[PDB]
Structure formats: structure tokens, C-alpha cells
Write a protein that binds this ligand. Structure first.
Ligand code: HEC
Ligand code: HEC
Ligand code: HEC
Ligand SMILES: O=N[O-]
Ligand SMILES: O=N[O-]
Ligand SMILES: O=N[O-]
Ligand SMILES: [Cu+2]
Ligand SMILES: [Cu+2]
Ligand SMILES: [Cu+2]
Ligand SMILES: [Cu+2]
Ligand SMILES: [Cu+2]
Ligand SMILES: [Cu+2]
Lengths: 456, 456, 456
């Protein structure tokens, strides 16, 4: 035979359940093959890739990753691709797991305002990436045109308590990481495989803080994990936990009891986790500068009873989660909007600075600015700061070392430079400091920082 | 014992069958261990890495990848490496799967005009990369000095209908992708792992168009897949199909039913495919900018009956294959030769432009230049073009957006910049357009494009 | 239950055995669960990353990688992290394999002069990376803050003759590869994943020459292999041998009989090797420019009887090991110290040049400078050199091609440029040549080379 030889479609056609990340459609829960009608529409739209940073995404179903598709092995799928009339570009679809030329791309070419259709049998069980395959293919994928399709085995997957949808992608902005405004696609960075962001589910903080995934102690969690690329291979890892199982695509091999696993560009895996201890468990790309400098972190938050026999210790997770430990960074979004409108207040800056100060400065100066006597000097009521508040701009951008004295105490240490911070970020952080802990007040502007950055 | 303990060589020595890519030597078809004499010669030679782009390759047996070697586990191999007297460099060989220092490299050091020999027992069954290991090793490998050796299990591999040889490599030219002429090796790009080309079998289009691999519906195909590197890891994938099996080197684990698989730098795998539906099936490195911007695409073309129950849809594959959908791009080769000779005609430019227009422009403007009314403006008999044919150079290089009117119709859309196109490519494409569809004619030269590219 | 449900700790607390690379603590050799007290101290210190190149490493226990920790699955581990008072930075620890938030990082935040403690049960058997997780996490890891923890299965691992500890890392210096002096961390290179060094065990030559690992023909060797990253994925490979087994972390799957294996950033594997033939077996990252241009090579040296039936050939391994074939390159270290002190002699330069000449020049000009008549011209008593010893600086930096005559013999070949050599390296190499083989003598200085490099 062929694989997936389960008989002809039976019953009425089914109009398929699509879901937006991070949710999954329900199990199909049937024992017969069906004709499944899938309707998916392309929408090109601006969304926030980071706080105060807009990007023109190209999407399947209005999200990155695109809508999740769920069918049964042996189903006949009638696929309808619509391209919204607001689109500027033509689009198509290639579904991994399809048996046929281009995985559909050859038959789904769709101009703005049009619709295409093609039909395929799902022979191949597994989790599979789908993506646009319109020239230039790389640009389409880089702009967010990918998602997952699950083809269930005929008996269905084993029951779990939660199923989630998480997809990594690499993104290429003309501006640098966290540079505000509408950021165009940068073809030069893309060709060179030098992304400015590496993200889960299309944005920094998409799955952190108040947007974390949830489960309880004792529960099992399945995550359908994709890597849309376009270019990067993920050293996919869960901090502080282990995967009971990892299965790639439709593969017969299943790895068990691993914590770090390589997902190819265009690859997908199903992972399973059992919650044992409460807290935040972090999904990262363990090519570590991606996770901690470019946005590649997502959270699964577990609630329930402690188990001190398994893990007994403090819970100070801002030291690595940094500015993503908090529920959100909406103050940054708001300050950026106000700056664009020309209505930025001191308090707007202060609250944005407060959000950014977490991790970035607090790891050494503490959340209250007290420092640690003799080791990290205070920012709280700092005579050194007050003596020349402007010099703080140079200190942040270019670091500080050597002997200094602060609130009558000697320091001889090293503060690394932080030149990667953008002008608004430095301004906002310093404005927060100046207006906290009985410091002199005032404000620093982005334009002030720009001038200091530019001196030799 | 050791592994491969099958007895002493029997019979007469065998003088081994070497083959050029993409073919494989026949199965050894024997039940006893032999002494196998291998003779392989290094040749340094210019070949075309892309149409009109020459490169000085360093080769084992005159090809990239080098000649395929096939032996049986337990054989004693007497290896003779010759370095042709025309070579400028010394060379040697390291065969993965050899048990001994340097995999042979230590004993096969061979100056131009000389020959070396060493003997090894093939203890280890599997598919293995071989490559040069002469300082600087990276430069030798980057210049094309790698291939595969198969060491069969004693009972032989299972019968299939076709066996093919495909090897990925990353290449480092001083010039940019598709910049014409003889391109030197670029050490700086190589150290930084920033290749200009990523190719199967040593050239763009080596396995596309009229050079595709072939099979029929129902047939099984084994591909011996290598990654010579030097630096890249391939997210190796078949578009529109699945691998029945993937086996790395001589490993005991075999993965089944996967579509995307990671091949390490210096790694090799045996994959198996069963043809089910007619059409072109694309082998790519799914770090997508490699596949679609740097040459990393190869084709397996399947002929036979349609199976509409499995796949039913149109077959417009130029939308992703682009300029590699056609049998070849020989017009580009020819135009480049003519340009070098100072005998480039308008028609030379037109035919080269026609080849490059596929995908690159046709995805939006159509193959006939008609566009799509209101969405993509026409190039065919375009008043906007005719009004200022020179401005077309800026449109290609730097894009166009905003309200415009063309053949009495309003457009308000976005044409992305295409700055990665080389000066000759832009010139040739525009010359094609000007001389097609009752457009005004004339020509654009590479020197014209160069001037426009250089303005602020 | 949970996994690792073996009963409560019994007996007295055990104060755990830590070891420095490349050694491993002994097998725990017990059949009951224990309370294990681990004491690990962070020390920030300058060490030599390469000969004459210093770097400020941040370390767990004074080494890179950090001290190896060995416990039994089911143990309760009381972990004490001390941060030495000389440290400038705060630090913490995340142990992969820990079940709990941050793998401990959340509870081990430790300022200079302080100590922290947290307790965890080792539920998960396997080899696991541990690393610092203090913001900015990437900088901490890049500076060398990683190591391995082994959690044994309850019955212990199978007996082998040797166990070794090898950990890859990528490093980011402001200066270029082999540029002398104290090299700061370079954040820009790190974010871009463009390392200047890629090393085993924290330094070039850490495991080469007289620092190689050892075993004998017939013996089995287990290596606990880590990849600390921060960013790179290793195409981990043994030259001239094969791995009997490769097992990732605590995974249930075990691959057998492979030579090349991908280790994720933050990943760890246990590999097993059986010595069959004498010689040097090279562990590399087979992204080849890492192994041969950035330091990613380590040696296992096997002593014992030859087996000519398995491998019969010469042993000229300087052709690929290059300057790492010799016991060390201490002459380079010494010349650099002398240069810094202003006491650099001609002989200091000569001996440093001699060390660097191996591979770099000897592959073509031979170890004795004789060249090969008609193919590679002589450096020994070279009239061409003597005629204009200064022009040798341009020859090394920028190459030489075309017809030339040397000791009354015609050459028409190509010497590639070697611009990646640093000014001191070129100076020292040429000083060696001038003072060898009855050449005219004199010296070339680094400042001379600097001037020539800077001309147009
Ligand atoms: C890794 C530790 C660390 C981080 C992170 C850090 N600092 Fe510092 N900072 C120091 C140390 C140590 C000094 C003292 C340097 C010396 O001894 O020369 C210092 C000095 C200062 C000073 C001048 C002395 C004083 O107390 O007024 C200012 C202002 C300052 N830091 C602000 C910041 C701000 C704002 C941030 C975040 C953008 C930040 N620092 C991040 C460690 C750090
Ligand atoms: C992704 C879609 C797309 C691709 C690919 C594309 N174009 Fe365009 N092109 C457009 C659109 C849309 C416009 C109109 C822009 C506007 O509305 O401001 C345009 C405008 C033009 C115009 C001016 C208007 C006219 O009709 O004369 C020329 C000339 C042109 N394109 C040529 C090319 C050539 C040649 C190529 C390939 C090198 C190309 N274009 C590739 C979409 C595209
Ligand atoms: C890959 C081969 C190769 C390597 C490696 C190499 N050379 Fe050469 N070298 C040549 C060849 C061939 C020529 C002659 C070029 C010609 O024919 O135009 C040459 C020429 C020379 C000459 C001038 C002719 C003479 O004999 O005096 C000098 C000096 C020289 N090399 C020094 C060096 C030094 C020092 C190194 C290492 C830093 C080095 N070369 C590395 C091959 C090499
Ligand atoms: O556990 N590493 O981020
Ligand atoms: O199926 N991806 O090119
Ligand atoms: O065997 N490769 O270096
Ligand atoms: Cu698209
Ligand atoms: Cu794909
Ligand atoms: Cu070679
Ligand atoms: Cu190799
Ligand atoms: Cu640290
Ligand atoms: Cu980690």
C-alpha cells in the first residue's frame, strides 16, 4: 500500500478548527478518515515585535506563528488559501508532511484579493512546519510566514493535561535590538544569518510575565515546538526541568529524559514535561546570547505545593530573567508612544526606567539602589551621582573603573560598559535613578545620550 | 576480536571502481574480504561555480565532491594518492572511518608530481567523509577537497532502484554571490563562517533543471549525503516528500519517517526515499537563505502517473524554484563570456535577462509582464517605464513605493529593493524588459547600473 | 512516584570530591542514597588563553571548565556557592539536571565575599552542564563560568580504564586571534556569535603536546564532553578513530559506532573510545575553521604495539597538527614576556619563529628550508631572500606569485597570502629564517611588519 491507507473519506466534510498561538485545536477524537476543509487567510499587518518597536509582519491567520492546523493521518485535506486584499505581496503555502511538489506551494500561489485551493492526503503522521514559499522565500519566512500542522496518528496522541504551541523564529531589523520605531526588514543581516531578534511566538515577552504558559504540580504538559527559522538552529532547552520525551516530526525514534535538544531550521518536535516543583521554567535557545540578548525566552509557570525534599531554596529570579521577571514592560511601550507624540513626561521616563533597571542595574546596585558597602556603590542618595549627574551617561555607555569614593566609602572595582543600550533606554534608566531614593531629580533625554555617545 | 574480523584478504587484488558525482560505484557483491587497491589523483583546476563565475577548485579526481570510493567492511585497502604535476600545493587525505593517525593524513602527504601510499583495514562499516588535511586545512577543504567513502556491511546494503551521491559544501569568494569573473578564495569570510555560496556538488545548478536526478513513481532511491563543510551544519530537508530512513555514518541508530535532519560539518548520512507522486522534489539546506539565496538546492525529478487522491493541484513551481525551474541558465554564461570578449549584443543581454527574470520579477509582474490590474503594475508596454527607462535602474536597486499610475491605472503598493542583484544582472534584466512586449527597446549596460548604484 | 525514588539519605553526610579538568572524581561506589555537601568557590583571575595572550577568566574552582561534580541519582545535594572576596562581580549557579527554578540560580545569588546555599535532590541521572546565570548571562558564560556535573545511575557506569573531562567553549576577545597582551571581553563579537577562539578546556594547547590525554592499545576511554558555549554548536569529532558509544545528558537513546556528533550549546555527552592503534587521535569541532584556525583541537595519545594489518603508513602529523605537533610553544610565551619587558633578544625571536614555522611554512618549504626543486623554492641559503630580506615581509603578508628564480632555478607558482598572522608572529618567523640555514642573519621587528602591513 501507501502509508495512511485507512479507507476513503467517510461522513460529512469537516470544516477544520484553527487556533492562534499559544493554543492548539482539540484532539480530533475520531476513528475514521474524513474530508477536512481548511481555510487560512494571509494578512500583512504591523505589530509590536518589542516594546515601542513595530514591524510589518506577514502572517497566516493574523499571528506569528500562524494558525495551528490539526488533522488525522489518512484524512483528505482540501486546502483553501486566501490572500487578503490589503496585502501588497503574493503568497503561497508549503506544508511539510504533504506528499507532492512544493508541499502545496506549486498549487497555492495566491495574489492579493484571491484564493487558491489544492487537495492532499495526509499520509505522514507527525508535527510539521508549514511556511510561505514565494520568491524571495527567505524574506517571506523572515517576516513571520510559518506555523505548525499536526497530523495525528489514527489512535490519537496520549492524553495530557495541557497542550501548547511555541515556535521559534529569527528576525532581521534594519535597526539594532530594542531601537524604537517601525523597523524595516534587513536583507543584508538575513543573508548573513545575523538576526537582531530571536523570538518565541513573534515578539519579545510573548510568553513571559503575565503571558506565561500555566500548569500545576503533578500535571503533564505537551508542547508542539517549531523552528520557523529562517536560518537558525535552536539549542532548545528548558531551564530547571527535563523533557520526559522529545519526538521530531513523524519520526519513529523517541528520545527520553533530555534537557537540551537541537531543532533544525524548518524542524518541529513534540516535547512532554511533567510538573514537579512550583516556579517559572524557562524555554530558551541555549545559544545563550539569543536567549538573554535577543528575546529567545518563554515561561511555563507552575503553581502548587512546594516539595522541599526535591528543591529547597530562595526564589530571586530577576537575577537571570531580568526585565522579564515582571508581569510586563508596558511602561516602555507607553513612554515610547508619548515620545513619538511629543508628550513624554518625567514620570513616563521614570516608570520606563524602573522596568529596564531590573536585572540590567539591579543585579549589582540592588533593586533599592543601596549597593553593597565596599563592593557595589550606592545609587540611592549618591553623592557621586549628584556631583555630576551628566557623567552618569558616560558611566552607563562606557563603564567605570578605578578608585572612586561614594557616600564616604572607597571603591576600586569595575562596571562594564553597556553600549548596547539604546539612547532612550539610557535616558529613561538614568531619569528613574535621579527621581528615586532622594536623588536630585531632573531628567536625562535621549538626545542628551545621543550627544555623549557621539563624542571621541 | 576487533570489529570487521572476517578473515585475511582472499583472491586477487581488486582495483577499485571510483565514480564521479552524482553517481555511485556498483555494490561490491561479494562474500569474502579482499585487498582493494585505490588510486586517486589530486587535480587543481578552474571550473564554473555559477554561470559566468569561475573558481579555482582543488579536487580529488577532478570533481567536487571527489570521486566516490566503495569497499566492504573487513577489506584491506592499499591507498595510492597522486598529486598531479600541475598542482601548486601539496595535498594529503584523511578518510573518516579509517582506524589510525589522521585517518591516513599522517601517511599520504604528497607534493606536486609525487605519489604516496598507505594501507588500512576497513573495520568500520558506514558512509564517511574523506577530505584533505594539509595546512591550512580549512583552505584546502573550502576549495573543494572532500568526498565520500562507503564501507558496506558484509551482506551488502538492501537493493534499491537508484543510488545517488550528493554533497553539500560552503564556499568563500572575495566577490559577492553571482559577481562574475574568476573569484579568489576569501580567508576572512571563511574564518568568520560567512559563505558566499552554499552548494550541492560544487556549483549552482549542479543538480537542477536538465541536471536533476531521476526516478519513477514506485521506485526507491538511496542518496549518500555528505557535508564537506568546511563550517556549516545542514538542516537537510526534502521539499514535498519524506525520508523512509536516515542513518548517520556507521551508526546503529536509524531514524525513520523524517523530513528534516541535521548533518554536522564533516558528517555523512544515507537517506532513503520512495517515489509516490510525480514532480520535482527539492533537496535543500533549510537554513533558508542558503537554499534560496546562496545555491543550496538540488532536484530529484519523478516521472509517472498522477495520484489525484494523494495530491491534486496546479504545478507552478517557478514561484519558488525561480530561475532554477528552467533547464539551465546558459544564456547567462554566454552573455558573460561575450562581455569579457567585448562582443556583447543586445540579444545576448535579452536572453540572459529572460533567464534571470523568472521568479525574481515574474512572481509579481508575471511571465508575460501583464502584472495584475490594480495590484501589480504591468511591465508589458508600460507607459511609466517608457516615460523614463533609466529610472527603472533605481526601481530595481532601491525599490519603489507610493502612489503611481501606469497604463491609466492607479497603484499604491511596495516593490522591495533588490540591491543584491549585480550590475550585469540588473542591466540584462532591464534590457530584456525593454525589448519585450512592445516596449521601446534599447539596452541598459552594467556600467550604467554601476553609476546609479554609486549615487547618494 | 518521582524518578530517583531510592529512599531517604543514609549514613553520614559526604563532603563531595571535586576535580580539575581534565580529570574526573572517582565513581561514588555506593548502593545507598546520601546527603552530599558540595562546596564550590568562584574566582576571577587572569590566565593565558594562548601563548602571550592573557584573559580575565571568571571561574568555578579556579579552572575553565570548572570543577567536576559527581553524585549518585537519588542523592540529596546541599550546595554551597562561595564568591571569593577578590571578585568584582556577583555570581550564581544553574545546574542542568536540577528540578527547580533556575536549576538553582534563583537561590545561589552570591556577592563577592559571600556564600549561598540551596538543597536539591538529584532525580535525573546523566551528564549535565552547569553554568553561571547572572545578568548579563552571556558575558558570565563567555568568561568561562561553566562545567559538568555527573549524576550516576544507581548501579554506576560500566568500568573503563580512563575517564577524562573535556569541555568546549567559544571566546570573544577585542583583539584578533593570537594578538598578544591582556584581551578584554568583546560584547559585540559575542552578540554576533563571531568568536575569536574556540577552545577545549580554556586555552589553546590545553590538551595538546605534552598536555595530551593518554591511554594504551587495548584500553577503553570514557570522555565526559561538555559544550559550554555560550553560542556555538560543536560538530564534535575524533580524527582517526570512532566512538563505540555516544549518550547525551540522561537520555535513554544511545548512538553507537559514530565518528561525528552534534553537541548543542549547553549540551553534554558521554563518549566511549577503545584504543586500537598507537598515535595521536584528535578531538575537534569539525566546523573546520574552529579546529584549525581558532584552537579547537585536543589530543588523546595512544601508546603500544603497532598493528600493521589495521594501519600501515608513515607518521608525519605536523602537516595537520602544525604548530601543535610539538610538546609546547613555550618559546612564544617567552618571547612575548621579553618583548613586554623590553629585553627581547634575537635568539628569543628565533626560537619563537621556529615554533611558529611548523605547519605554517614547513608544509611547503620543509622543516629544513630546502623546499622541493622546481615546486617549492628554498628558504635555506636563499639568494632571493638575501637579495632583499625586507621584501619577505610583503611575501608573508600578501603572498607571492609569478615567475621568479631562486638559487639558479625557475619557479612559477603561488604562495597564498598569510595576513592573519600578527606582526610579532611574522617578525619572529622571518627572524628564525634569517638566522637559520646560513642565511644572512639580522632580525625583523614587529614594528617593521606593522609599517609594511599599513602601506597601500
Ligand atoms: C556588574 C556590576 C554592575 C552593573 C550591572 C551596573 N553597575 Fe554601576 N557600578 C558598578 C561598580 C562596581 C561601580 C564602581 C566602579 C569603580 O569602583 O570604579 C559602579 C558605578 C556606578 C555609578 C557611579 C558611582 C555611584 O554609585 O554613583 C553609577 C551612576 C552607576 N554605576 C550606575 C549604573 C546603572 C544605572 C546601571 C545599569 C544601566 C549600572 N550602574 C550597572 C557595578 C555595576
Ligand atoms: C514583490 C513584488 C514585486 C517584485 C518581485 C518586483 N516588482 Fe516591480 N513593482 C511592484 C510593485 C507593486 C510596483 C508598484 C510600486 C508602487 O505602487 O509604488 C512595482 C513597480 C515596477 C516598475 C515601475 C512601474 C511599471 O509598471 O513600469 C518597474 C519598472 C518594475 N517594477 C520592474 C521590476 C523588475 C524588473 C523586477 C525584477 C528585477 C521587479 N519589478 C520585481 C512589485 C514587484
Ligand atoms: C602553500 C605553499 C607555501 C606555504 C605554506 C608557504 N610558502 Fe613561501 N612560497 C611558496 C611558493 C610556491 C613560493 C614561490 C612563489 C612563486 O613561484 O612566485 C614561495 C616563496 C617564498 C619566498 C621567496 C622565495 C624564496 O625561496 O626565498 C619566501 C621568503 C617565502 N616563500 C617564505 C615563506 C614563509 C616564511 C612562510 C610561512 C610564513 C611561507 N613562505 C609559506 C610556497 C609556500
Ligand atoms: O540553563 N541555561 O540557561
Ligand atoms: O520546505 N522548505 O523549503
Ligand atoms: O577529520 N577531520 O579533521
Ligand atoms: Cu508569503
Ligand atoms: Cu520548508
Ligand atoms: Cu589539499
Ligand atoms: Cu575530518
Ligand atoms: Cu558569574
Ligand atoms: Cu543552561
Amino acid at each position: 500500500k501507501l502509508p495512511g491507507d485507512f479507507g476513503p473519506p467517510r461522513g460529512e466534510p469537516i470544516h477544520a478548527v484553527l487556533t492562534s498561538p499559544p493554543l492548539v485545536p482539540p484532539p480530533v477524537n475520531r476513528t475514521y478518515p474524513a474530508k477536512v476543509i481548511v481555510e487560512l487567510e494571509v494578512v500583512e499587518k504591523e505589530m509590536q515585535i518589542s516594546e515601542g518597536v513595530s514591524y510589518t509582519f506577514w502572517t497566516f491567520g493574523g499571528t506569528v506563528p500562524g494558525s495551528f492546523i490539526r488533522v488525522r493521518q489518512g484524512d483528505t485535506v482540501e486546502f483553501h488559501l486566501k490572500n487578503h486584499p490589503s496585502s501588497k505581496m503574493p503568497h503561497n503555502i508549503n506544508l511539510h508532511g504533504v506528499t507532492g511538489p512544493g508541499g502545496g506551494a506549486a498549487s497555492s500561489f495566491t495574489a492579493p484579493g484571491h484564493e487558491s485551493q489544492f487537495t492532499f492526503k495526509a499520509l505522514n503522521e507527525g508535527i510539521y512546519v508549514y511556511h510561505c514559499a514565494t520568491a524571495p522565500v527567505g524574506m517571506h519566512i523572515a517576516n513571520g510566514m510559518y506555523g505548525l500542522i499536526l497530523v495525528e496518528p489514527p489512535e490519537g496522541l496520549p492524553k495530557v493535561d495541557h497542550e501548547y504551541y511555541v515556535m521559534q523564529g529569527d528576525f532581521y531589523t534594519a535597526g539594532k535590538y530594542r531601537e524604537k520605531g517601525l523597523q524595516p526588514f534587513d536583507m543584508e543581516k538575513a543573508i548573513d544569518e545575523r538576526p537582531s531578534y530571536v523570538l518565541f511566538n513573534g515578539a519579545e515577552g510573548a510568553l513571559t510575565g503575565d503571558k506565561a504558559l500555566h500548569a500545576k504540580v503533578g500535571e503533564t504538559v505537551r508542547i508542539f515546538v517549531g523552528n520557523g527559522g529562517p536560518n537558525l538552529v535552536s539549542s532548545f532547552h528548558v531551564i530547571g526541568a527535563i523533557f520526559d520525551q522529545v519526538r521530531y516530526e513523524g519520526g519513529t525514534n523517541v528520545q527520553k529524559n533530555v534537557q537540551t535538544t537541537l531543532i533544525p531550521a524548518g524542524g518541529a518536535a513534540v516535547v512532554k514535561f511533567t510538573a514537579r516543583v512550583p516556579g517559572s521554567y524557562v524555554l530558551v535557545d541555549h545559544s545563550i546570547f539569543r536567549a538573554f540578548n535577543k528575546g529567545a525566552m518563554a515561561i511555563l509557570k507552575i503553581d502548587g505545593a512546594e516539595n522541599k525534599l526535591v528543591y529547597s531554596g530562595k526564589e530571586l529570579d530577576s537575577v537571570y530573567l531580568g526585565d522579564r521577571a515582571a508581569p510586563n514592560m508596558s511602561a516602555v511601550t507607553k513612554a515610547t508612544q508619548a515620545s513619538v507624540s511629543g508628550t513624554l513626561t518625567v514620570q513616563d521616563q521614570v516608570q520606563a526606567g524602573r522596568a529596564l533597571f531590573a536585572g540590567t542595574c539591579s543585579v549589582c546596585h540592588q533593586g533599592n539602589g543601596a549597593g553593597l558597602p565596599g563592593v557595589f556603590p550606592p545609587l540611592a542618595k549618591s553623592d557621586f551621582l549628584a556631583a555630576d549627574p551628566k557623567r552618569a551617561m558616560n558611566i552607563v555607555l562606557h563603564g567605570l573603573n578605578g578608585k572612586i569614593k561614594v557616600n564616604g566609602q572607597e571603591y576600586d572595582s569595575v562596571m562594564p560598559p553597556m553600549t548596547q543600550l539604546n539612547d532612550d533606554e539610557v535616558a529613561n534608566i538614568l531619569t528613574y535613578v535621579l527621581n528615586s531614593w532622594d536623588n536630585p531629580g531632573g531628567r536625562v533625554s535621549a538626545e542628551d545620550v545621543k550627544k555623549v555617545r557621539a563624542q571621541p
